[PDB]
Amino acid sequence: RAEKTGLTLALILLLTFFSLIVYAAKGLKIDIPTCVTDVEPFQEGKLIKHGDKRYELHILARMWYFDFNKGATEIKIPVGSVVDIFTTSKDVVHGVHIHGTNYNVMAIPGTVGYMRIKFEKPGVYHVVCHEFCGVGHHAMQGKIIVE
């Protein structure tokens, strides 16, 4: 018929879409945030793990400001570095969008969003929060300056 032609068109379309998203998610790993569990108490955080490039960032998201170091809404990181960003809110469900990169994770209380990005191009990377977290949400951001 013609319904079969429409259907094979839709099917080849969606199969192409899906083959590519699984390709990008497996090769050249752009891994969506998964479940990570080692200990993760998490009200703190930043460690210069392997010195020049590797890091471990712990952006606890208190209510109405982020916490990149011990109470410092901004942070400075050497270029090219490859951070290991863990995110966990203190109180409510908090968005953590890092505008330059594709780090778009929720900070759910009692969970530890893991994702591993590298800051190839210098500049400033605003860490904005999108999910709603009460009044005084619109004034919740903080920068990851990569000079």
């Binding site: 839709a10 879409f17 594709n102």
Partner: protein, 32 residues
């Protein structure tokens, strides 16, 4: 009766898709 028009309308779809989708996918890749 053969719906010869909707087949071409689909061909126009899913090439409008698979262009919008591919632009946002390329934004995904271009973001490191």
């Amino acid at each position: 009766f053969f719906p010869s028009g909707t087949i071409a309308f689909f061909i126009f779809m899913m090439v409008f898709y698979a262009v919008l989708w591919f632009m946002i996918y390329w934004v995904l890749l271009e973001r490191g």
